[PDB]
Amino acid sequence: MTLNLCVLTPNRSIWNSEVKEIILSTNSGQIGVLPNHAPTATAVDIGILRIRLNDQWLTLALMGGFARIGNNEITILVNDAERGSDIDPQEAQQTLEIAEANLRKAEGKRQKIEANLALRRARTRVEASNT
Amino acid sequence: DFNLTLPIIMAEFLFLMFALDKIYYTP
Amino acid sequence: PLIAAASVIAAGLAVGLASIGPGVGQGTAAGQAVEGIARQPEAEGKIRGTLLLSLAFMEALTIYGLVVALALLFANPFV
Amino acid sequence: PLIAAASVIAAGLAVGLASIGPGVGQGTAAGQAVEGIARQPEAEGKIRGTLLLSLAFMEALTIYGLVVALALLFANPFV
Amino acid sequence: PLIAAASVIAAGLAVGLASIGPGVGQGTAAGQAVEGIARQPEAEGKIRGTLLLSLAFMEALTIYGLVVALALLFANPFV
Amino acid sequence: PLIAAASVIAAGLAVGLASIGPGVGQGTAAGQAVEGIARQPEAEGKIRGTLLLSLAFMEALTIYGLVVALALLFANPFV
Amino acid sequence: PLIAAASVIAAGLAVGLASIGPGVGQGTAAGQAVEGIARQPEAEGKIRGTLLLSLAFMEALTIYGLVVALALLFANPFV
Amino acid sequence: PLIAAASVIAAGLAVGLASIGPGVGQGTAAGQAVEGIARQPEAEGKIRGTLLLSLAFMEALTIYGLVVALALLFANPFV
Amino acid sequence: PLIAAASVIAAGLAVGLASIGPGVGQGTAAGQAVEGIARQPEAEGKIRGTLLLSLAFMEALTIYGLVVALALLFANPFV
Amino acid sequence: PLIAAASVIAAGLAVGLASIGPGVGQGTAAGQAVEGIARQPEAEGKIRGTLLLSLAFMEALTIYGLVVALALLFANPFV
Amino acid sequence: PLIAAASVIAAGLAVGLASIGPGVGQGTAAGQAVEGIARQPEAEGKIRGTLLLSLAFMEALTIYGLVVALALLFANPFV
Amino acid sequence: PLIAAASVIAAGLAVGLASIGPGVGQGTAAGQAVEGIARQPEAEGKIRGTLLLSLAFMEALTIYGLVVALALLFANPFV
Amino acid sequence: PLIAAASVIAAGLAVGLASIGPGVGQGTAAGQAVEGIARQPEAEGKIRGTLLLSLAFMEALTIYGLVVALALLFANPFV
Amino acid sequence: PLIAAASVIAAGLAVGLASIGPGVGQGTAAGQAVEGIARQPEAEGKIRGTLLLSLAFMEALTIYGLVVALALLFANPFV
Amino acid sequence: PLIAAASVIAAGLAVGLASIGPGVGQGTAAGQAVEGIARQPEAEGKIRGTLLLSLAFMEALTIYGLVVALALLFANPFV
Amino acid sequence: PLIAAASVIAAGLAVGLASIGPGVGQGTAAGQAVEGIARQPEAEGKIRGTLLLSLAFMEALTIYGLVVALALLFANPFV
Amino acid sequence: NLINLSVVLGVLIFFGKGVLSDLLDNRKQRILN
Amino acid sequence: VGQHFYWQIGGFQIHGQVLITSWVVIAILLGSAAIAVRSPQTIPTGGQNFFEYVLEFIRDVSKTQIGEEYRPWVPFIGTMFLFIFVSNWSGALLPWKIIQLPHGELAAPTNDINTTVALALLTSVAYFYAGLTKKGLGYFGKYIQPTPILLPINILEDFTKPLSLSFRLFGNILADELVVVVLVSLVPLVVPIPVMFLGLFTSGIQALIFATLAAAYIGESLE
Q: How many whole angstroms separate alpha carbon I9 and alpha carbon G11?
């Protein structure tokens, strides 16, 4: 009932099993991917991939990347992913807090990009504390 | 045309409100 | 006399100006709906149901115009 | 006389010019709504509810125009 | 007399202004539908069915206008 | 006489030309709002509240036009 | 007399205003359909069938207008 | 006489032509504002405040038109 | 008399308003078709065949208008 | 007489045609301004100041039209 | 008399309204065709042949209008 | 007499048709200027100066129209 | 008499309505052609030849209109 | 008499129809110019000079229209 | 008499309706040509030559209209 | 008499309808030219020269219209 | 009104039973699980 | 056709049409409500499933719209929604043609303007009552917070929104009534079947939309 997905990481080739719904979030916004979807190129961003096993809404925090998505061939070139809640949930809330700790500085325009990536990385990291 | 049918309908509707509350909505 | 003639002209203008814009609307709806249904082959039934409801709203506006025209034509209260 | 004829012409122009733009609006709404509902198959119920509320607002404007036309036609205070 | 002439002018204006916008709508529908059906060669049957239903709605609005014109022309209740 | 007839024509033109543009506006609002609410399934309640406030502003303009038409129709200060 | 002259003017305005918009619609349909058929060289037969059905709907609206014009011209019920 | 009738026609044309464009404007504003508020769920309060100020400007223009119409209707300095 | 003059004016308005929109349509069709045929140099024959069929439909609508004009001009049933 | 009636018609046409386009302009301004302010949450104060200045320019044009209408209505130099 | 004058006015309106839209169409065709021929420098001959055929169809519609105008002008069957 | 009435109608048409297009222009200017100023938060002062100069040019055209209207109204050289 | 005056009005309307649309068409053609010729600096000669042929077709339609106007003006068969 | 009244109506129509389109043009110019000047903060002086020259051309066309209106108003060669 | 007056009105309508569309065309041509010449700084001479040829075609259509107007004005064959 | 009045109305309509479209054209030209000159800061002199030549062509069309208006106003060959 | 009301009532009763079956199946799945 | 009144003269003028329609509709609604809920189980029995699903959808639309304190106006909103739903269903599903009313005609409750105006005044005064209960008694939401010129504009818009809802309801009811009347008056009653189906769908949609609009005005009162 599903598509060949390739959750591809720099050093990793995270699971090649296959599931129903793909609600990857781009810079524009989310889009729901299901079987026989039209072949699309999407710049998936720091939001969260929620995965529908067809039994379970399991939910993967991905750090970023790209998704070349086609006819049951779909390929997501992730920057970094953690399958489900691979991080610890209380530690997920704690990572939100400790990247809150280092977002408190401000360096011009210059390292505000680092501040943004820290805060949004924690903001997708807090997902596995949520569910 | 705005006759007394307005107050008649409002009075009949408040009874239906309280009657739904008493009969089905609370039970 | 002139009253029934002007009522007929009223019904004709009403029917034409009502059918003009709603056709264009329903067509734009159908085009983007078909593009979306081609983009995703999954929810075609619910998409067709929602499109049927919206086309029913547009055709209901068109039928209100056509009913005003038929009331002017067949049994007009003025003439 | 001429008064009821002009009231009929008024009702016809009102109905046509009211139904013209709202059909195009509701169609653009339906097209982009169906494109969005195809993009995301999750919130179709709430999307259909919001679209029904907005189409109800547009059809309420159209029904206000049709009611002004019917008041001019059936029981006009002038003629 | 002048009443049948004005009813004929009404039917002509109704038919023209009804056929104008719906043709443009159905054409935009057909263009985006053909672009989508070329993008995905799978659901052409259901896409053609939905497009036929929507074109039937547009042609039903056009046929309502043409029927009002034919009622004004052949057997008019005024003249 | 002619004064009440012209007031009726005024009310009809007012109602039609008021309902024309606001329907198209509310439809464009609804289409882009539904596209956005499909893009993000989170803030649908606040989005629906803001859309209801804006549609209330548009329907308030339309109701001001309809109220001017009803004041011209039912109890006109001129006729 | 003046009645047949006004019926002829009605038929002319009907034919022109009917043929105007449908030509533009069918052209937009043909342009996007040819762009799609060039994008995908596979489903040209089904695409041509759907385009023929839609162009048949548009030409059916145009033929309804032309038939109303021919009924006004050749054997008019008024004159 | 004719003066109050023409003042009524003036008020009707003023109200309709004032309400036409501002509805479309406020709708385009609402659509892009809702798309933006869906894109960013953070500054919804300040966005709603700025949108309320701009919709207040548009409704102030519409209310200036409606006030000119009410001044022509109720207590006209000419008639 | 005036009847043949009005029939001539009818034929002129019919021919002009028929040729206006179809030219724009066929031009948009040709532009996007040539852009597509430049994008893909493979299916130029089938693309030219489909474009010829669609341009034949548009020119058939234009020829129906021109034939109504020639029937009004040369051998009119009214005058 | 007819002079004050034509001055009233002038003021009505002036007010309507002045309020039409500026509402659409201010709405397009507000929509793109809100989209930008959502894109960047930093310079909302200066953006609101510039938008207030531009909306003040548009409302100043609208107020010039409304002031010409009020000068025609209340104390006209002609009548 | 008045018949030849009205036939001349018919021919003028026919020629102008026929030449209006087809020029815009052929221009849009030429613009997108030149953009495509610049995008691909390979099939310029077949592209020019197809563009010549389509411009011949548009100029054939324009020549049908001009021929109806010349038939009204030089040797009119009415006058 | 009729001369001052026609001069008043001239001033009203001048003021309305002058204020119509310039409002839309200044609004498009303001919208794209605010989008740009949100895109770059650096040169807001020079951008506001250039926008003020251009809005001054548009309001100068509008003030030329309003001054022609005031010259027709208050102290007309004809009447 | 009135016949030559109406023929002159016919020629003027023909020339204006013929020159209107073809100028816009040739301009759109020139704009996209210059954009393409800037995109590719290779086939400027063949592009200029094809653009000259298409502009010759548009100017031939315009010259047909101007020739009908000159035939109405200088040596009219009616007057 | 009627000659000075028609000259005043001419000046009013000239001023309004001249100020309409040029305002929209200068606004589109200003919007895209401000977007570009925000995209590149380097050549703002030369960009402002070129924009001032083009706005001077547009305001020169508007001033030619206003000067024709003032010549019709103040010292008309006819009346 | 009335013949020279109608010929003058013909020349005025011809000149205005001819200059309207060609200005917009040449402007769109110039805008896209300048965008292309900025995109590629190489073939500015040949691009300027082709743009000059196309602007010469548009100004030749405009000069044909202006020459018809001057022939109607200075030495008219009718009056 | 009426001849000079109609010539004045002709000159006014000519000037307004000539200045309308060319302002919009020159504005679109200026906007895209400024966007391009911001995109590339190199060829500003040649770009300004080409833009000055094209704006000179547009202002030459506008000056031809203004010269026809001044010839109708100051020293008319009819009156 | 009678014939159209009867046709609409038949189709509505059939489809309303078909939809209330799904709603009651959802509620039954909830309580059962 | 004839939509004025019947002179059941007491005190002043009265319209018997909406009186009879409102009595019949409220009686049918309360009688359907009390009969299957006289002994309801925790499992969704015969009428219990329909009544519980109605209460569930109403509670969903109310808890989504108003915010937190959606419980206190839940019977009021459900009364408005079910009253409009039953009136729009029964005015079309009930035959009034074989039986003849002498003085005027009588089909549906909201056909008179007074019914819609009374429901609108009920909703508007309930919104103002919630604004007085929640916000300060000195100045409610008519206070001009953003700029000092919006006080009478906000007051006029607040006065207009009730009449807007009443006009929407009256427009829908009269649209369905005129559609059925003219379609039956055209020719024999076999032609108008698809338009009647569309009218029934529009009746259900208008019921849900009236529920949502009442909840929207209630959330405005919550603001």
A: 11
What CA–CA distance (Å, rounded) separates Q16 from K8?
67
From M4, which residue of chain K is nearest by alpha-carbon distance?
A: K5
Q: Which two tokens stand for residue D23?
A: 């059909």
Q: Rounded CA gap, L69 and L71, in Å?
A: 5
DSSP letter (8 states) at residue R146: S
**What phi, psi does H46 have (nearest 5°)?**
-65, -35
Q: Nearest CA of chain H to the CA of R100: how many Å? A: 41
For residue R62, the SS3 value is helix
Distances in whole angstroms, Cα of residue I68 to Cα of each of G68, G70, J47, K18: 11, 8, 59, 15
Alpha helices in chain R (DSSP H): 16-36, 46-65, 74-93, 113-134, 151-186, 193-222
Q: Which two tokens stand for residue K45?
A: 């001959």
Q: Read off φ and ψ for residue A63, nearest 5 degrees.
A: -80, -35
Do R19 and B9 contact (CB within 8 A), yes or no? yes
SS3 content of chain H, % helix, strand, coil (to 5): 85, 0, 15
Contact indicator for E7, C7 with CB cutoff of 8 Å: no
3-state secondary structure of I77: coil
| CA–CA distance, M66 with K19 (Å, rounded to integer) | 11
Distance in angstroms (rounded) separating the CA atoms of residues H25 and H30: 9
Structural element, H or E, at residue O30: helix O2-39
Which 31-60 residues of chain E touch chain G by CB within 8 A? 31-39, 41, 44, 47-48, 51-52, 55, 58-59
Output the six-digit token pair for M9: 């009005």
Which amino acid, R187?
V
Where in chain R are the domains?
1-223
Q: Please give the Cα distance from A67 to A25 (Å, whole number).
A: 10
Which resolution in angstroms does this entry have?
Answer: 5.2
Across the interface, whether the CB atoms of L33 and N35 are under 8 A apart is answered yes
Q: Give the integer Cα–Cα distance in Å for M36 and R40.
A: 76
Q: Which of N69, N68, N55 is nearest to N22 (CA)?
A: N55
Give the Å distances, CA to CA, from M73 to H43, M5, M66, M77, P9. Answer: 68, 10, 10, 10, 22
What domains can you pick out in chain L, each with its CATH number?
A: 1-76 (1.20.20.10)
Which of O15, O19, O32 best tests the M interface by mutation, with the highest count of M CBs <10 A?
Answer: O32
| Distances from the Cα of C59 to the Cα of A78, C63, K9, angstroms | 47, 6, 40
Q: Please report all neighbours of O, defined by 3+ CB atom pairs within 8 A.
A: M, P
Place of tokens 């539904």: F34
Q: Which domains does chain A have, with CATH numbers?
A: 1-87 (2.60.15.10), 88-131 (no CATH)
Question: Measured between alpha carbons, how far is E31 from E40 in angstroms, rounded to an integer?
Answer: 14
Contact H55 F50 (CB under 8 A): no
H helices then E strands: how many in chain A? 3, 5
Q: Give the C-alpha separation, O24 to N21, whole Å.
A: 10
One-character DSSP codes across Q1-33? -HHHHHHHHHHHHHHHHHHHHHHHHHHHHHHH-
The three-state secondary structure class of A40 is strand
Experimental method: cryo-EM
Q: What is the gyration radius of the CA atoms in chain D, in angstroms? A: 18
Distance CA I6, CA R220 (A): 61
DSSP, residue by residue, M27-65:
HHHHHHHHHHHHH-SS-HHHHHHHHHHHHHHHHHHHHHH
The CA distance from A130 to P5, in Å, is 81
Structure tokens, L13: 């048409």
User: E4 is written with which tokens?
Assistant: 């049948």
Q: What is the C-alpha separation between B10 and G65, in angstroms, rounded? A: 52
Nearest by Cα to I25 from G32, O20, O22: G32
